[PDB]
Amino acid sequence: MMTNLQKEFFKRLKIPAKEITFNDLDEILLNMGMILPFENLDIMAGTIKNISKNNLVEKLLIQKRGGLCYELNSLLYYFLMDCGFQVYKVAGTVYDLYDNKWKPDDGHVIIILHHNKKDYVIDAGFASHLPLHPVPFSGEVISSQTGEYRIRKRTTQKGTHILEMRKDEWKIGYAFTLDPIDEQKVNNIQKVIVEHKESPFNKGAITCKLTNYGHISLTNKNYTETFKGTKNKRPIESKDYARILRESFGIT
Numbered sequence: 001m002m003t004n005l006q007k008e009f010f011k012r013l014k015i016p017a018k019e020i021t022f023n024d025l026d027e028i029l030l031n032m033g034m035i036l037p038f039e040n041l042d043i044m045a046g047t048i049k050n051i052s053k054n055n056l057v058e059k060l061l062i063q064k065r066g067g068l069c070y071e072l073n074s075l076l077y078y079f080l081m082d083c084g085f086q087v088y089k090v091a092g093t094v095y096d097l098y099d100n101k102w103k104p105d106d107g108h109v110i111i112i113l114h115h116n117k118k119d120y121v122i123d124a125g126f127a128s129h130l131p132l133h134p135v136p137f138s139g140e141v142i143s144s145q146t147g148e149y150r151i152r153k154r155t156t157q158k159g160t161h162i163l164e165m166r167k168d169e170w171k172i173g174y175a176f177t178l179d180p181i182d183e184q185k186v187n188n189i190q191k192v193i194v195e196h197k198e199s200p201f202n203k204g205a206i207t208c209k210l211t212n213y214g215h216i217s218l219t220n221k222n223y224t225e226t227f228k229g230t231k232n233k234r235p236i237e238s239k240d241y242a243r244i245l246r247e248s249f250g251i252t
């Protein structure tokens with residue numbers, strides 16, 4: 001019936017095995033955001049394997065770990081393919097809002113879905129900026145607990161399209177193109193994130209996840225909680241780290 005990946009996927013995301021249709025994508029994205037932590041711990045620990053369906057199922061589903069955008073969306077890609085959707089992966093380049101500049105070229109991986117003559121961006125790897133719904137190329141606003149999002153076909157130094165977002169003023173989240181990327185490219189993207197001097201992900205541990213009242217983030221130095229409108233940062237010690245990872249993110 002269902003593939004091994006589908007079976008494991010349903011189990012991990014606590015979603016009853018069933019046929020997945022377009023209208024079911026919201027539920028998929030929601031659970032992923034609430035359960036699959038956004039993290040770079042393998043990069044920190046120096047235990048990085050190449051990306052593949054099997055490796056993704058082993059790490060994110062079976063060993064109940066999380067991952068970065070290229071892992072989260074690669075897994076979802078495989079899942080959606082098994083579910084029979086018309087999907088493909090494309091590279092993206094994120095914009096650094098604090099320092100006004102583009103992060104490394106193609107440091108993000110997203111999914112483009114074609115459904116009923118319409119294209120949508122499917123993204124479960126943007127950490128705390130998760131749309132939690134397919135974002136239509138037609139431009140209508142998509143709103144969720146994380147903020148508002150919209151797609152615009154605008155050429156930029158890094159692409160042909162952009163995903164903009166806001167809580168008040170619209171700003172570029174990331175730029176992208178519709179050029180299909182394969183596993184080798186995805187493995188190249190991983191390597192660049194592991195070694196680029198300006199890579200945001202090889203400078204310190206990060207683990208983030210959505211909650212019913214916001215989202216939570218944990219670094220080696222601080223635990224940041226966004227809760228019912230409030231945002232607190234608490235310095236932590238070595239032992240608080242291991243405990244929070246476990247208790248708040250299910251990572252053991």
Ligand SMILES: CC(C)(COP(=O)(O)OP(=O)(O)OC[C@H]1O[C@@H](n2cnc3c(N)ncnc32)[C@H](O)[C@@H]1OP(=O)(O)O)[C@@H](O)C(=O)NCCC(=O)NCCS
Nearest residue numbers: 069108125126127128129200201206208217219221222224
């Ligand atoms: C990760 C993220 C949720 C952190 O923001 P937050 O939860 O609102 O809380 P803060 O902004 O105060 O940041 C908390 C910690 O995240 C760290 N951080 C932010 N972005 C980071 C990144 N890309 N890599 C590693 N650490 C990061 C900050 O340095 C901070 O550390 P500190 O508390 O020890 O000083 C937010 O930056 C985010 O959603 N980033 C998106 C990442 C992305 O582009 N993903 C797609 C490409 S893989």
